[PDB]
Assembly symmetry: C3
Homo-oligomer: 451 residues x 3
């Protein structure tokens, strides 16, 4: 229940190609980053499919094409009508199969990087060579970007388009090798074949959290850690271990869906046999699957809340972890009082959540303390104190959602640095207040490095 | 004219679904309002590719090859010389196709509505079937809304539920034309119109904006009835309230397209023949932009929620000017000064643009309306308002009017609306104008 | 270097909403980012229609090279022995881009030349072509006429509002394909985008080319239409817009020629130099390592770069507009709306790889913000907060001329600063990008 009271600094992210930030207090901008991401991923997928369909089928199996065809090409009726359970199983299996292939590739490269030099095979030597050539490009890019900064800057380290970022940053491209416009990542392949899209379409279960970042913050940090000097093989692993963390987190989610939730969906279909007009054993009726609806504010994302009074200095993050690790934390801000709150919380009791030992406080208990502790600060004006006291007896106003790309543990670690690292706290709050709020979001999602 | 006090200083829900549902915006943000339209167009174009690929044979079997002809002209073929398309024949084809799609939608809702308000014994086997299938979807929506309601904090103002477009179609769409109970395959009349670029081509050839001719993705009165019956099964009669709201909008759309065909189409034909000797290389097969500027509505007189700001630096003052479809040439004023807890309402006169049907000459000018508004507002500080832009609405004009009416008269509404950051309060007013809020 | 005091009828942004290029609040990093994201998605959807409708005619006119660049970008992926020579590709895409814009340029030149030629001197086809251009201008005039009497007594906003397809039909002087058929008009900007020419150059080299574009409407064309109310715009007056277009086309042509003669040879050199610095090096591949030599810092790209004050102020914003690399020029344009203050200053040339060398005059961007922030901070040394980028569509000279009117035209200064401050900032952006006309 941390109530910590708050040179060049860089957001560990790339603009253009990289994932977007938003002002936490702007519901519109947060909604639009998701809308734009979906439209951009759909246009990318057409290129992946056209370029690589034969090779995707050869590697991952025709199941991926089957899920794609069902999603957007064919609609079967009567006797030929698709078994939607068989479809749901197919899409879950395909998603898990794509991410496990990604994981194995990063594991192999990570293992090779921490395997002396003499001990490395010819192909281990080859593969580290190819990875280091890309890292050299990223290093030179970051070098040129760094001396372009003003004496006192708070901004993202670099700026490259998605195609340039894939060519330089993506460690283990599945197809597309060293041809720009042709690089096919596991995230691109999943999106192209609409694997998550179909799982969500059939079950109502949101899976936006099951993704990977386009660049690893710890990779960027290591490049800055070694200025001109070549980043150690060991230092590179930090980024690669962050990636495997997220991949394993994704794999555990899909396995939790297959072993825990899939059996109950099957059960629900047979139970509703006499509750549904023209019931079919081949169809998942929306009625049968509302059993597994998480409340919109309990999905695995950064949920943003505003103060119940007119304030642009107060915002609450409530970040929820994947369902299999049924965890969440509170991160509150009052920039007018230079105040930051952190707290670990209890587990939700929604259908999708895995059961844990019942420790931690309620989100409700957490916002009462946030407003309470704020009203006690010596820095607070008599007007502000009275507004915080009114808000405390009041409840926070839900704005919306902002999906995160790192592991839940890494977002937790990012939040921890925002509450404890006092050096961080003084390079973050500079410039227009609305700009400060974006920077806090960026610090929560990726991290900032001070120089 | 109605002028009350939005008293500032329970739970209140916006009758809309996030994700799948139509978007709101801060009225004072011109950028966000512009981008909701841009994003909607891009999302509808991606959806249309799936509708076309999955259903083209069945669309042609049901609505006729005219829809495919409009699509092909819009985005697949470009004919030249002797084979060059008669653009009037095209304009007629697209208007006819649009009208044919919406009349099929209307007939389906009518049939379901009629069945729902028929004695159980009186209902046919298929009427019993169809109400069964509709109720199964409503049960899903009810359970969804039930789970969503106990997730709310003690004091919340937000949208009732959150589901993706594909989940919302499966649970909310009463009369899917194709796609039955297969997610990713449900084809609505709104999806079919968009997929075949019917409005797109009418606008492209005439310059006439038709953004207003749409249907909502969920009926607010349907959501209201579900909340009206907590766990308890919504009455068949109660369900009709949403279905009647839908038929209102469909009939409103049908009257617009009929107004375009009988009133405006003849004058466009006339204008082409009149400009015979005013146009270099004139063709009877081409609609020249010169000939069709006669029918240009001023950008601020289109059927939408038009947003204006105060001529001084204020984030508390904003004016809605909502214009009805051209056939019902009506509009109203809805002014806000949140600093003074003030709301203005007023019915206004009819515009004299080409597209407007003539009415009896009552009501004050928009100019007369802002003078009073700004007079009261400037007391806190003649003034002319700053136009920000447009925000298209999905319900009937009558339902938006009714929504505006509740913002001026329902004092219980006024006290749950202005809470949190002022920018958030402005979005909530927009949401209340577009969909409505229910208090609990 | 000019420092003036902004002072304070109808005033109009010389742009069309819907179909026309977007503005943004300079102090909103999100809205600036999203206008670019939306533009790319809209251009990709448009390109599918251009390709499907016109592929045979594009190949007949410009050659199969355009289709080859498109196919490489989004349709095929060759491997092993059959793998594409990425240098041959880069040359092909640069050649194709240059070939499309030079065809556009020649068409505007021909129409411009005809418009200045005395009526008797004009050929039958010169008479035809001016007739067709004037019919479109009449449509634009009537559109603008109807739009003008819809304005309130005191209005500051864009002159007109039409969708892209309606704007192409009425405004685009020299459509390459699509003639007088809405949904079918193919501009050089549409054709370039459809065949992913710049997309592939950027994808292979990392060099941003967002600046190489044309506006969807010429501000000087709109100005001339307002200059002649009901009265027919003179042939000579129309040329002002047509000369602005040729300015931008020639600016684009000089950039691509600068890329081909100056930068392309060094990229080829860099590939051979890194022969022993790259694991599994190929003479057919452009490795990202080899092309970082030519990376412009993100804040030095040819765009309107926006900076905020290092303190909490919504009245202070700095434009730093950078010209195309071949004309290695830039200027500073600072605003403090709380003090009614505007700063202008010409600056020095950047020393990034892509910049053509000039004579070493002008002050540093750092020197420029020091003074700006000094005067501004008096209301409250300081370093500005970078927000992001906003690409411009007119010639660099025309944006410079637009900035000049914001600092010197005192009549302009009093119709711009009216209404909510956030709205005022958008209007300044609009005035910088297109211009405003007062009536």
């Amino acid at each position: 229940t941390i109530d910590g009271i708050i040179k060049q600094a860089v957001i560990l992210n790339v603009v253009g190609g990289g994932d977007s930030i938003a002002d936490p207090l702007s519901p519109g901008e947060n909604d639009m980053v998701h809308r734009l991401k979906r439209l951009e991923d759909e246009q990318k997928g057409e290129i992946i499919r056209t370029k690589h369909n034969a090779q995707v089928i050869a590697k991952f199996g025709r199941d991926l094409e089957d899920v794609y065809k069902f999603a957007s090409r064919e609609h079967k009726v009567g006797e030929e009508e698709e078994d939607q359970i068989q479809m749901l199983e197919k899409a879950l299996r395909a998603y898990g199969n794509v991410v496990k292939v990604e994981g194995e590739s990063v594991q192999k490269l990570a293992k090779a990087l921490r395997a002396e030099e003499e001990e490395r095979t010819d192909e281990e030597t080859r593969m580290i060579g190819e990875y280091r050539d890309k890292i050299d490009a990223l290093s030179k890019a970051i070098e040129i970007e760094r001396e372009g900064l003003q004496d006192e800057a708070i901004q993202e380290i670099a700026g490259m388009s998605a195609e340039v970022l894939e060519a330089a940053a993506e460690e283990v491209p599945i197809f597309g090798a060293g041809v720009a416009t042709s690089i096919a990542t596991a995230r691109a392949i999943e999106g192209a074949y609409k694997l998550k899209a179909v799982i969500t379409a059939l079950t109502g279960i949101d899976l936006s959290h099951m993704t990977t970042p386009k660049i690893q913050p710890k990779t960027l940090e290591a490049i800055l850690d070694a200025p001109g000097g070549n980043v150690t093989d060991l230092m590179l692993t930090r980024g690669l271990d962050s990636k495997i963390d997220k991949i394993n987190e994704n794999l555990a989610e899909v396995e939790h869906m297959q072993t825990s939730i899939l059996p109950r969906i099957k059960k629900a279909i047979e139970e509703d046999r006499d509750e549904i007009t023209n019931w079919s054993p081949k169809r998942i009726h929306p009625k049968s699957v509302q059993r597994f609806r998480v409340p919109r504010m309990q999905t695995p994302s950064i949920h943003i809340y505003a103060a119940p009074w007119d304030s642009d200095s107060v915002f609450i993050f409530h970040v929820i972890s994947p369902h299999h690790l049924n965890e969440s934390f509170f991160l509150g801000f009052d920039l007018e009082i230079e105040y930051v709150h952190y707290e670990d919380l209890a587990q939700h009791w929604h259908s999708l959540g895995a059961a844990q030992e019942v420790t931690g406080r309620t989100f409700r208990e957490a916002y009462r303390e946030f407003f309470n502790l704020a009203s006690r600060s010596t820095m607070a004006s008599d007007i502000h104190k009275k507004r915080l006291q009114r808000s405390r007896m009041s409840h926070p106003i839900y704005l919306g959602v902002h999906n995160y790309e790192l592991s839940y543990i890494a977002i937790k670690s990012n939040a921890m640095q925002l509450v404890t690292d006092e050096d961080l706290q003084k390079h973050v709050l500079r410039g227009p207040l609305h700009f400060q709020r974006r920077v806090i979001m960026a610090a929560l999602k990726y991290g900032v490095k001070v120089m």
